[PDB]
Amino acid sequence: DSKTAPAFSLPDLHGKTVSNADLQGKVTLINFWFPSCPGCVSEMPKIIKTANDYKNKNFQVLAVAQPIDPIESVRQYVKDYGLPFTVMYDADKAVGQAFGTQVYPTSVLIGKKGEILKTYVGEPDFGKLYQEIDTAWRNSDAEGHHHHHH
Numbered sequence: 001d002s003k004t005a006p007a008f009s010l011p012d013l014h015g016k017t018v019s020n021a022d023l024q025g026k027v028t029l030i031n032f033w034f035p036s037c038p039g040c041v042s043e044m045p046k047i048i049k050t051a052n053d054y055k056n057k058n059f060q061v062l063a064v065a066q067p068i069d070p071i072e073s074v075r076q077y078v079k080d081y082g083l084p085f086t087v088m089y090d091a092d093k094a095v096g097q098a099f100g101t102q103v104y105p106t107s108v109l110i111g112k113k114g115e116i117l118k119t120y121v122g123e124p125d126f127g128k129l130y131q132e133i134d135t136a137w138r139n140s141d142a143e144g145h146h147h148h149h150h
Contacts, residue, residue, distance in 0.1 A: 002098035005114035010095060012088045013075060018062070020114060027054075027136045028110040029061045032096050034068035035077045039105035042123055044081070051085035058112075059133065061085035066093050066104070109133070113142040 001008035009019040029050065031043060051061035063085055065074040071089045078087050090096045099108060101119070109118035109132065118132060141148055 001095050002100070003116040005110070005116055006098070008095065008098075010088060012062075012086050013071075013078065014086070018086070023110055023112075023114050025058065025112060027059045027112050027133065029059070029107055029133075030064055030110060031061070031105060031107040032064050032066060032090070032099075032101050033105045034065050035073045036069050037105050039122065043105060043107070046124075046126065047085060048081075048083070051083075054133070055084065059136075063087040064090050064096060066090040066096050068104075109136065111136060111139065111142050113144075115142060 001010075005020055005023055007020060009017050011017045029047070031047070033039065033043065037043070047061055047063065051059075054060075063083070065071075065087060067090070071091070074087060074089055077083065088095075096102075099116070099119075101108075101121075103121055105122065107120040107124045107129075108116065109120070111117045117136070120129065144150065
């Protein structure tokens with residue numbers, strides 16, 4: 001739930017539970033947002049293509065909407081604009097509180113090991129974001145003690 005991915009099992013808006021085991025092998029962009037977020041102008045079309053493109057690679061995007069707009073209003077966004085990425089509703093805000101963000105919007109980059117790497121706040125620089133996501137590819141192990149057995 002927090003950074004370095006402590007034990008978490010969170011059911012998304014579809015009712016299915018995502019957990020630590022799912023992060024192992026996939027790189028994940030978890031952004032904390034809300035339907036009425038000004039950052040959606042940048043993030044939304046950006047994330048549509050991002051989650052669609054890297055879907056067939058090994059990358060996944062998880063959009064976490066916290067209690068600013070109603071939970072259904074979040075679903076309105078996901079249903080209407082056909083969001084190809086999984087969205088959650090941080091009702092208790094504990095998952096967002098675990099990461100320690102508080103300021104929104106914010107895109108968090110999760111490595112393939114579970115380290116929880118990068119935190120973009122406000123406007124995520126697309127150029128360095130894509131190159132950094134590519135760096136997430138390039139980063140083969142992310143330190144396995146030079147003898148990967150996990």
